Amino acid sequence: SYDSSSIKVLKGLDAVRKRPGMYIGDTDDGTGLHHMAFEVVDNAIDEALAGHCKDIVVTIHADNSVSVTDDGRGIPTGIHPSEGVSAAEVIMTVLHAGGKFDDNSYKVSGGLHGVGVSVVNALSQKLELVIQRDGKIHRQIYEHGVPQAPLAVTGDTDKTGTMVRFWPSKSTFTNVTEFEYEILAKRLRELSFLNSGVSIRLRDKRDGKEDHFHYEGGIKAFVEYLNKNKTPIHPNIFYFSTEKDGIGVEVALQWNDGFQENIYCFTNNIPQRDGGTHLAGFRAAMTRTLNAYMDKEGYSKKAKVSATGDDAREGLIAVVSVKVPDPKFSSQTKDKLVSSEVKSAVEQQMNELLSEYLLENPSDAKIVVGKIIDAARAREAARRAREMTR
Amino acid sequence: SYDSSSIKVLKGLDAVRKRPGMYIGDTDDGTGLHHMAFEVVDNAIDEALAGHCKDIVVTIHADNSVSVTDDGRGIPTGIHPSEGVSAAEVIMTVLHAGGKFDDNSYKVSGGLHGVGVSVVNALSQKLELVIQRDGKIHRQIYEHGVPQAPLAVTGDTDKTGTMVRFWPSKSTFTNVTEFEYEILAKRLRELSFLNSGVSIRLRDKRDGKEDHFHYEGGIKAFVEYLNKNKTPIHPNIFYFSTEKDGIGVEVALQWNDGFQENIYCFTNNIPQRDGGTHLAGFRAAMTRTLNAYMDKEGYSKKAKVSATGDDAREGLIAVVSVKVPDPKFSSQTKDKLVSSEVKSAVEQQMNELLSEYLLENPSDAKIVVGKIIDAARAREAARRAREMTR
Ligand SMILES: Nc1ncnc2c1ncn2[C@@H]1O[C@H](COP(=O)(O)OP(=O)(O)O)[C@@H](O)[C@H]1O
Ligand SMILES: Nc1ncnc2c1ncn2[C@@H]1O[C@H](COP(=O)(O)OP(=O)(O)O)[C@@H](O)[C@H]1O
Ligand SMILES: [Mg+2]
């Protein structure tokens, strides 16, 4: 009997527990598990972006919990004017609640949805919250999303910042259930390249391992690092950082002699495994710019048409980092940027500055166009050989 | 000042309006716009899977609204025991509310999240709901997710079913703002193949175009259809339908003399553009079973070629439809199936039944092994041409 009592409402965090996938991604291959840590880390990184945080510590504890400590402003502690409990508690227990729905507290931020830490709380058997703010230490404990008592002041302090420690639910995550040092490390190293002047430490209390990331060279140094165990074919890394029409676009790239294409895209420091409109603008700009270059440098009809752009990306390492008010992602996990204004921002900036670069670095230009022509001839030899077997 | 008053709670459908992307996908390239219609259609299809709907009409109106009419049970109209308004209004206005969080009302369904049609409501400047249930017609109008009056009786009727008509918000959707007949057509045609006995009509009131899909041949006929403008190389389409351990696996496939690989994956009739565990099971079983056949029958030794999976899947058309209680996906839009048990389900059924198929149809088998050898030869020739060219 299908009727009005067959309609069930999942209230609060219950929905996240029932359908974790639409919030956190894959709960079985370990990626959603680490995404839990990434949501908390992103909150700290958003405090750094805002200029308030200079120090982040990520700890893997021996009981397989993870804590994230920052010296940012501290999650607000005051009673929320509508909910009647501390804003910290609102943040932990209510989906789509946060300070990132306007641009008053964070000019630009990666959190966006207002669900990150509440999702972490929902999917944790326990969460420990310590906030240093206004000269006070506030503490609260959650067990399966439920506060054990009101947020309480337990001591004095002269510091500001937030510590969140969480113990992931045994029920929710299957297969990969233990945090992997290296996944956390890769992410925190790239965050250090993205955020000069923020100290990011990673500590593993299970085996004593630790790391301290504080790279200064920004995404140039990032491209250099990514090319470390490869062979760059040209010495001058292309780099620029611009802000136009409210959108920041930062790009660094360099070719090696390998045949792989590695383009890392970020939006407000959030990585996009599936690319999107920044990567699309990047590709369009690269293709247009290299074709213009080969035309004005008088390459043959057939050598320029030869060059596809999929040829141009062989050997390519590139980092594309955009800063956007209100980006749009096509999922909670933000794997793909779908803000269409970003495509034209990246494409325009990159067309201009990459043109310049090719003019200003003729040696790099000749080398790279050579690589591209080689890649094209390889592709063509492969095609003809394929048709020969037919 | 960053404090408790900076923390905003977005209540109900307001969250979806503020952050549509995590619910509906890409609001800029037309895909999320059309997904609006697919959410509503999928609800009707769920009534069909449960056995209560034999007739669905999708209409594109001349004012760019879309309506979906089914003859299922009708969305329940009774006052919800806890929420105190009609269940229909609960369904339209509350995220994570519905009849698919247990298996009382639908044994298998694609909706899963309890958000589909309330997301459609949220992102519609207007939505018209008409329900025919228990001898009465009930109507309600919403504007940007806000009901204009409670669900009310408007008349008498002898039919049951649900009509949802929605006018997408001009603010949410950009660039592609008009419904495309063909996108809806492709999806509905495919749904007709997947759901024998369900009449599906598509009407375009902008130009009087219409279609009536009522295919009876199931996913075999689907493969036939997908291959009709191609050149199938063997006459017997491989097909099976099984259910084991609560998991339905249905597969049809046929090779053509082309070089593209087209595998369509579905979970509870929802397509997965990004594949997932069904596709992984499929791929593994295919590769293993064809290499097994090619070794025992001696083809690998005689042609001295060492075929790979990519060789196996060149020229392949396949449909993999799984039916699972509580599938897991990695986003609201359900692009990727991440239920781990499904990989094994598909892999085992494929290994068994595909083995049997190659034995019961030796002509087909010999043709297919021939294509695979050929593809392997092209691949290796291409590899050598590329390797030399450098
Ligand atoms: N480490 C932190 N330091 C300061 N404020 C924080 C921190 N973590 C969360 N917050 C506040 O909590 C809000 C809600 O966080 P969350 O639920 O993750 O959603 P979102 O980050 O998308 O707003 C944030 O927007 C920010 O206002
Ligand atoms: N056409 C329909 N006929 C009957 N019931 C429907 C129909 N559409 C929606 N419903 C009911 O409304 C509920 C909520 O739907 P929706 O918000 O789309 O989420 P979900 O489909 O995931 O349940 C469904 O679970 C079902 O009980
Ligand atoms: Mg957050």
Coordinates of all heavy atoms in Angstrom, one line a residue, chain A residues 216-282:
Chain A
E216 N 58.3 27.9 -1.5 CA 58.1 29.3 -1.8 C 57.8 29.6 -3.2 O 57.2 30.7 -3.5 CB 59.3 30.1 -1.3 CG 59.2 30.4 0.2 CD 60.4 31.3 0.6 OE1 61.0 31.8 -0.3 OE2 60.7 31.4 1.8
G217 N 58.3 28.8 -4.1 CA 58.2 29.2 -5.5 C 56.8 29.2 -6.2 O 56.7 29.5 -7.4
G218 N 55.8 28.9 -5.4 CA 54.5 28.9 -6.1 C 54.3 27.9 -7.2 O 55.0 26.9 -7.2
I219 N 53.4 28.1 -8.1 CA 53.1 27.1 -9.1 C 54.2 26.9 -10.1 O 54.3 25.8 -10.7 CB 51.8 27.2 -9.7 CG1 51.7 28.4 -10.7 CG2 50.6 27.4 -8.7 CD1 50.5 28.4 -11.5
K220 N 55.1 27.9 -10.3 CA 56.4 27.6 -11.0 C 57.2 26.5 -10.4 O 57.6 25.6 -11.1 CB 57.3 28.9 -11.1 CG 56.9 29.8 -12.2 CD 58.1 30.8 -12.5 CE 59.2 30.2 -13.4 NZ 60.2 31.1 -13.9
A221 N 57.4 26.6 -9.1 CA 58.2 25.7 -8.4 C 57.4 24.3 -8.4 O 58.0 23.3 -8.4 CB 58.5 26.1 -7.0
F222 N 56.1 24.4 -8.4 CA 55.3 23.2 -8.5 C 55.6 22.5 -9.9 O 55.8 21.3 -9.9 CB 53.8 23.6 -8.4 CG 52.9 22.4 -8.2 CD1 53.4 21.1 -7.9 CD2 51.5 22.6 -8.3 CE1 52.5 20.1 -7.7 CE2 50.6 21.5 -8.1 CZ 51.1 20.3 -7.8
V223 N 55.6 23.2 -11.0 CA 55.9 22.6 -12.3 C 57.3 22.0 -12.3 O 57.5 20.9 -12.8 CB 55.7 23.6 -13.4 CG1 56.4 23.0 -14.7 CG2 54.2 23.9 -13.7
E224 N 58.2 22.7 -11.7 CA 59.6 22.3 -11.6 C 59.6 20.9 -10.8 O 60.3 20.0 -11.3 CB 60.4 23.3 -10.9 CG 61.8 22.9 -10.6 CD 62.6 24.1 -10.1 OE1 62.7 25.1 -10.8 OE2 63.2 24.0 -8.9
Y225 N 59.0 20.9 -9.7 CA 58.9 19.7 -8.9 C 58.3 18.5 -9.7 O 58.7 17.4 -9.6 CB 58.0 20.0 -7.6 CG 57.7 18.7 -6.9 CD1 58.5 18.2 -5.9 CD2 56.5 18.0 -7.1 CE1 58.2 17.1 -5.2 CE2 56.2 16.8 -6.4 CZ 57.0 16.4 -5.5 OH 56.8 15.2 -4.8
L226 N 57.2 18.8 -10.4 CA 56.5 17.8 -11.2 C 57.4 17.2 -12.3 O 57.3 16.1 -12.7 CB 55.2 18.3 -11.7 CG 54.1 18.5 -10.8 CD1 53.0 19.5 -11.4 CD2 53.5 17.2 -10.3
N227 N 58.3 18.1 -12.8 CA 59.3 17.7 -13.8 C 60.6 17.1 -13.3 O 61.5 16.7 -14.1 CB 59.5 18.8 -14.8 CG 58.8 18.7 -16.1 OD1 58.5 17.6 -16.5 ND2 58.6 19.8 -16.8
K228 N 60.7 16.9 -12.0 CA 62.0 16.6 -11.3 C 62.7 15.3 -11.9 O 63.9 15.3 -12.1 CB 61.8 16.5 -9.8 CG 62.5 17.6 -9.0 CD 62.1 17.5 -7.5 CE 61.9 16.1 -7.0 NZ 61.9 16.0 -5.5
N229 N 61.9 14.3 -12.0 CA 62.3 13.0 -12.4 C 61.9 12.8 -13.9 O 61.7 11.6 -14.3 CB 61.8 11.9 -11.6 CG 62.0 12.1 -10.1 OD1 61.1 11.8 -9.3 ND2 63.1 12.6 -9.7
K230 N 61.8 13.9 -14.6 CA 61.6 13.8 -16.1 C 62.7 14.7 -16.7 O 63.5 15.3 -16.0 CB 60.2 14.3 -16.4 CG 59.1 13.4 -15.9 CD 57.8 13.9 -16.4 CE 56.7 12.8 -16.3 NZ 56.5 12.5 -14.8
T231 N 62.6 14.8 -18.0 CA 63.6 15.6 -18.7 C 62.9 16.7 -19.5 O 62.4 16.5 -20.5 CB 64.4 14.7 -19.7 OG1 64.9 13.5 -19.1 CG2 65.6 15.4 -20.3
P232 N 63.0 17.9 -18.9 CA 62.5 19.1 -19.6 C 63.2 19.3 -20.9 O 64.5 19.2 -20.9 CB 62.8 20.2 -18.6 CG 62.8 19.6 -17.3 CD 63.3 18.2 -17.5
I233 N 62.5 19.7 -22.0 CA 63.2 19.9 -23.2 C 63.5 21.4 -23.5 O 64.2 21.8 -24.5 CB 62.4 19.4 -24.4 CG1 61.1 20.1 -24.6 CG2 62.2 17.9 -24.3 CD1 60.2 19.6 -25.7
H234 N 63.1 22.3 -22.5 CA 63.4 23.7 -22.7 C 63.4 24.3 -21.3 O 62.7 23.8 -20.4 CB 62.3 24.4 -23.5 CG 60.9 24.4 -22.9 ND1 60.4 25.5 -22.4 CD2 60.0 23.4 -22.8 CE1 59.2 25.3 -21.9 NE2 58.9 24.0 -22.2
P235 N 64.3 25.3 -21.0 CA 64.6 25.7 -19.7 C 63.7 26.8 -19.1 O 63.6 26.9 -17.8 CB 66.0 26.4 -19.9 CG 65.9 27.0 -21.3 CD 65.0 26.0 -22.1
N236 N 62.9 27.5 -19.9 CA 62.1 28.6 -19.4 C 60.6 28.2 -19.2 O 59.9 28.0 -20.1 CB 62.2 29.8 -20.3 CG 63.5 30.3 -20.5 OD1 64.1 30.8 -19.5 ND2 64.1 30.2 -21.6
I237 N 60.3 27.9 -17.9 CA 58.9 27.6 -17.5 C 58.0 28.8 -17.9 O 58.2 29.9 -17.4 CB 58.8 27.3 -16.0 CG1 59.5 26.0 -15.8 CG2 57.4 27.2 -15.6 CD1 59.7 25.7 -14.3
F238 N 56.9 28.6 -18.7 CA 56.0 29.7 -18.9 C 55.2 29.9 -17.7 O 54.6 28.9 -17.1 CB 55.1 29.3 -20.1 CG 53.9 30.2 -20.2 CD1 54.0 31.5 -20.6 CD2 52.6 29.7 -20.0 CE1 53.0 32.4 -20.7 CE2 51.5 30.6 -20.1 CZ 51.7 31.9 -20.5
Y239 N 55.1 31.1 -17.2 CA 54.3 31.4 -16.0 C 53.5 32.8 -16.1 O 54.1 33.7 -16.6 CB 55.2 31.5 -14.8 CG 54.5 32.1 -13.6 CD1 53.5 31.5 -12.9 CD2 54.9 33.4 -13.1 CE1 52.9 32.1 -11.8 CE2 54.3 34.0 -12.0 CZ 53.3 33.4 -11.4 OH 52.7 33.9 -10.3
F240 N 52.3 32.9 -15.6 CA 51.7 34.2 -15.3 C 50.7 34.1 -14.3 O 50.2 33.0 -14.0 CB 51.1 34.8 -16.6 CG 49.8 34.1 -17.0 CD1 48.6 34.5 -16.6 CD2 49.9 33.1 -18.0 CE1 47.4 33.8 -17.0 CE2 48.7 32.4 -18.4 CZ 47.5 32.8 -17.9
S241 N 50.4 35.2 -13.7 CA 49.3 35.4 -12.7 C 48.6 36.7 -13.0 O 49.2 37.8 -12.9 CB 49.8 35.4 -11.3 OG 48.7 35.2 -10.4
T242 N 47.3 36.6 -13.3 CA 46.5 37.8 -13.6 C 45.2 37.8 -12.8 O 44.7 36.7 -12.5 CB 46.2 38.0 -15.1 OG1 45.5 36.9 -15.6 CG2 47.5 38.2 -15.9
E243 N 44.6 38.9 -12.6 CA 43.3 39.0 -12.1 C 42.5 40.0 -13.0 O 42.9 41.1 -13.1 CB 43.2 39.4 -10.7 CG 41.8 39.2 -10.1 CD 41.5 40.0 -8.9 OE1 41.7 41.2 -8.9 OE2 41.0 39.5 -7.9
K244 N 41.5 39.5 -13.7 CA 40.7 40.3 -14.5 C 39.2 39.9 -14.4 O 38.9 38.7 -14.4 CB 41.2 40.2 -16.0 CG 40.5 41.2 -16.9 CD 40.7 40.8 -18.4 CE 40.6 42.0 -19.3 NZ 41.6 42.0 -20.4
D245 N 38.4 40.9 -14.4 CA 36.9 40.7 -14.3 C 36.6 39.9 -13.1 O 35.7 39.0 -13.2 CB 36.4 40.1 -15.6 CG 36.5 41.0 -16.9 OD1 36.2 42.2 -16.8 OD2 36.8 40.5 -18.0
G246 N 37.3 40.1 -12.0 CA 37.1 39.4 -10.8 C 37.6 37.9 -10.7 O 37.5 37.3 -9.7
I247 N 38.1 37.4 -11.8 CA 38.6 36.1 -11.9 C 40.2 36.0 -12.0 O 40.8 36.6 -12.9 CB 38.0 35.3 -13.1 CG1 36.5 35.3 -13.0 CG2 38.6 33.9 -13.2 CD1 35.9 34.7 -14.2
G248 N 40.8 35.4 -11.0 CA 42.3 35.2 -11.0 C 42.6 34.0 -11.8 O 42.0 32.9 -11.8
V249 N 43.6 34.1 -12.7 CA 44.0 33.0 -13.5 C 45.5 32.9 -13.3 O 46.2 33.9 -13.5 CB 43.7 33.1 -15.0 CG1 44.3 32.0 -15.8 CG2 42.2 33.2 -15.2
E250 N 46.0 31.8 -13.0 CA 47.5 31.6 -12.7 C 47.8 30.3 -13.5 O 47.2 29.3 -13.3 CB 47.7 31.5 -11.2 CG 49.1 31.6 -10.9 CD 49.3 31.7 -9.3 OE1 48.3 31.5 -8.6 OE2 50.4 32.0 -8.9
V251 N 48.9 30.4 -14.3 CA 49.2 29.2 -15.1 C 50.7 29.1 -15.1 O 51.5 30.1 -15.2 CB 48.7 29.4 -16.6 CG1 49.3 28.2 -17.5 CG2 47.2 29.3 -16.6
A252 N 51.2 27.8 -15.1 CA 52.6 27.5 -15.3 C 52.7 26.3 -16.1 O 52.0 25.3 -15.8 CB 53.3 27.4 -14.0
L253 N 53.6 26.2 -17.1 CA 53.8 25.0 -17.8 C 55.2 24.9 -18.4 O 56.0 25.8 -18.4 CB 52.7 25.0 -19.0 CG 52.8 26.0 -20.1 CD1 53.7 25.6 -21.2 CD2 51.4 26.3 -20.6
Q254 N 55.5 23.7 -18.8 CA 56.8 23.3 -19.3 C 56.7 21.9 -19.9 O 56.0 21.0 -19.4 CB 57.8 23.2 -18.1 CG 59.2 22.8 -18.6 CD 60.2 22.9 -17.5 OE1 60.0 22.3 -16.4 NE2 61.3 23.6 -17.7
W255 N 57.3 21.7 -21.1 CA 57.3 20.4 -21.8 C 58.5 19.6 -21.4 O 59.6 20.1 -21.1 CB 57.3 20.6 -23.3 CG 56.0 20.9 -23.9 CD1 55.1 20.0 -24.4 CD2 55.4 22.2 -24.0 NE1 54.0 20.7 -24.9 CE2 54.2 22.1 -24.7 CE3 55.9 23.5 -23.7 CZ2 53.3 23.2 -25.0 CZ3 55.0 24.6 -24.0 CH2 53.8 24.4 -24.7
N256 N 58.3 18.3 -21.3 CA 59.4 17.4 -21.2 C 59.5 16.5 -22.4 O 58.8 16.7 -23.4 CB 59.2 16.5 -19.9 CG 57.9 15.9 -19.9 OD1 57.6 15.0 -20.7 ND2 57.0 16.3 -18.9
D257 N 60.4 15.5 -22.4 CA 60.6 14.7 -23.7 C 59.8 13.4 -23.6 O 59.9 12.6 -24.5 CB 62.1 14.4 -23.9 CG 62.7 13.5 -22.9 OD1 62.0 12.9 -22.0 OD2 63.9 13.2 -23.0
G258 N 59.0 13.2 -22.6 CA 58.1 12.1 -22.4 C 56.9 12.3 -23.3 O 56.8 13.3 -24.1
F259 N 56.0 11.4 -23.2 CA 54.8 11.4 -24.1 C 53.5 11.5 -23.4 O 52.4 11.4 -24.0 CB 54.9 10.2 -25.1 CG 56.2 10.1 -25.9 CD1 57.1 9.2 -25.6 CD2 56.4 11.1 -26.9 CE1 58.3 9.1 -26.3 CE2 57.6 11.0 -27.6 CZ 58.5 10.1 -27.3
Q260 N 53.6 11.8 -22.1 CA 52.4 11.9 -21.2 C 52.0 13.4 -21.2 O 52.7 14.3 -21.5 CB 52.7 11.4 -19.8 CG 53.0 10.0 -19.7 CD 51.9 9.1 -20.2 OE1 50.7 9.4 -20.0 NE2 52.2 8.0 -20.9
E261 N 50.7 13.6 -20.9 CA 50.1 14.9 -20.7 C 49.6 15.0 -19.3 O 48.7 14.2 -18.9 CB 49.0 15.2 -21.7 CG 48.1 16.4 -21.3 CD 46.8 16.4 -22.2 OE1 46.6 15.5 -23.0 OE2 46.0 17.4 -22.0
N262 N 50.1 15.9 -18.5 CA 49.8 16.1 -17.1 C 49.4 17.5 -16.8 O 50.2 18.4 -16.5 CB 50.9 15.7 -16.1 CG 51.2 14.2 -16.2 OD1 52.3 13.8 -16.6 ND2 50.3 13.4 -15.8
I263 N 48.1 17.8 -16.8 CA 47.6 19.2 -16.5 C 46.8 19.2 -15.2 O 45.7 18.7 -15.2 CB 46.7 19.7 -17.7 CG1 47.5 19.5 -19.0 CG2 46.3 21.1 -17.4 CD1 46.6 19.8 -20.2
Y264 N 47.3 19.8 -14.2 CA 46.7 20.0 -12.9 C 45.8 21.2 -12.8 O 46.4 22.4 -12.9 CB 47.7 19.9 -11.8 CG 48.5 18.7 -11.8 CD1 49.6 18.5 -12.7 CD2 48.3 17.6 -10.9 CE1 50.3 17.3 -12.8 CE2 49.0 16.4 -11.0 CZ 50.0 16.3 -11.9 OH 50.8 15.1 -11.9
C265 N 44.5 21.1 -12.6 CA 43.6 22.2 -12.5 C 43.1 22.4 -11.1 O 42.7 21.4 -10.5 CB 42.4 22.0 -13.4 SG 42.9 21.7 -15.2
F266 N 43.0 23.7 -10.7 CA 42.4 24.0 -9.4 C 41.5 25.1 -9.4 O 41.6 26.0 -10.3 CB 43.6 24.3 -8.4 CG 44.6 23.2 -8.3 CD1 45.7 23.1 -9.2 CD2 44.6 22.2 -7.3 CE1 46.6 22.2 -9.1 CE2 45.6 21.2 -7.2 CZ 46.6 21.2 -8.1
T267 N 40.5 25.2 -8.5 CA 39.7 26.3 -8.4 C 39.6 26.6 -6.9 O 39.2 25.8 -6.1 CB 38.2 26.0 -8.9 OG1 38.3 25.6 -10.3 CG2 37.4 27.3 -8.9
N268 N 40.0 27.9 -6.6 CA 40.1 28.2 -5.2 C 40.8 27.1 -4.4 O 40.3 26.6 -3.3 CB 38.7 28.5 -4.6 CG 38.0 29.5 -5.4 OD1 38.6 30.2 -6.2 ND2 36.7 29.7 -5.2
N269 N 41.9 26.6 -4.9 CA 42.7 25.6 -4.3 C 42.1 24.1 -4.3 O 42.8 23.2 -3.8 CB 43.1 25.9 -2.9 CG 44.1 27.1 -2.8 OD1 44.8 27.4 -3.7 ND2 44.1 27.8 -1.7
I270 N 40.9 24.0 -4.8 CA 40.3 22.7 -4.9 C 40.7 22.0 -6.2 O 40.5 22.6 -7.2 CB 38.7 22.8 -4.9 CG1 38.3 23.6 -3.6 CG2 38.1 21.4 -4.9 CD1 38.5 22.8 -2.3
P271 N 41.2 20.7 -6.2 CA 41.6 20.1 -7.5 C 40.4 19.6 -8.3 O 39.4 19.2 -7.7 CB 42.5 19.0 -7.0 CG 41.9 18.5 -5.7 CD 41.5 19.8 -5.0
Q272 N 40.5 19.7 -9.6 CA 39.4 19.1 -10.5 C 40.0 18.0 -11.2 O 40.7 18.2 -12.2 CB 38.9 20.2 -11.5 CG 37.8 21.0 -10.9 CD 38.4 22.0 -9.9 OE1 39.1 22.9 -10.3 NE2 38.1 21.8 -8.6
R273 N 39.8 16.8 -10.7 CA 40.3 15.6 -11.4 C 39.7 15.5 -12.8 O 40.3 15.0 -13.8 CB 39.9 14.3 -10.6 CG 40.3 13.0 -11.2 CD 39.8 11.8 -10.4 NE 38.3 12.0 -10.1 CZ 37.4 11.6 -11.0 NH1 37.7 11.0 -12.1 NH2 36.1 11.8 -10.7
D274 N 38.5 16.0 -13.0 CA 37.8 15.9 -14.3 C 37.9 17.2 -15.1 O 37.1 17.3 -16.1 CB 36.4 15.5 -14.2 CG 36.2 14.1 -13.5 OD1 37.2 13.4 -13.5 OD2 35.1 13.8 -13.0
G275 N 38.7 18.1 -14.8 CA 38.9 19.3 -15.5 C 37.7 20.2 -15.5 O 37.1 20.5 -14.4
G276 N 37.2 20.6 -16.7 CA 36.1 21.6 -16.8 C 36.5 22.8 -17.5 O 37.4 22.8 -18.4
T277 N 35.9 23.9 -17.2 CA 35.9 25.1 -18.1 C 37.3 25.8 -18.0 O 37.7 26.3 -19.1 CB 34.8 26.1 -17.7 OG1 34.9 26.4 -16.3 CG2 33.4 25.4 -18.0
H278 N 38.0 25.7 -16.9 CA 39.4 26.2 -16.9 C 40.3 25.3 -17.9 O 41.1 25.9 -18.6 CB 40.0 26.2 -15.5 CG 39.7 25.1 -14.6 ND1 39.2 23.9 -14.9 CD2 40.0 25.0 -13.2 CE1 39.1 23.2 -13.9 NE2 39.5 23.8 -12.9
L279 N 40.2 24.0 -17.8 CA 41.0 23.2 -18.6 C 40.6 23.4 -20.1 O 41.5 23.4 -21.0 CB 40.9 21.7 -18.3 CG 41.6 20.6 -19.1 CD1 43.1 20.8 -19.2 CD2 41.3 19.2 -18.6
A280 N 39.3 23.6 -20.4 CA 38.9 23.9 -21.7 C 39.4 25.2 -22.3 O 39.9 25.2 -23.5 CB 37.3 23.9 -21.8
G281 N 39.4 26.2 -21.5 CA 40.0 27.5 -21.9 C 41.5 27.3 -22.1 O 42.1 27.9 -23.1
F282 N 42.2 26.6 -21.3 CA 43.6 26.3 -21.4 C 43.9 25.6 -22.8 O 44.8 26.0 -23.5 CB 44.1 25.4 -20.3 CG 45.5 25.0 -20.4 CD1 46.5 25.7 -19.8 CD2 45.8 23.8 -21.0 CE1 47.8 25.3 -19.8 CE2 47.2 23.4 -21.1 CZ 48.2 24.1 -20.5

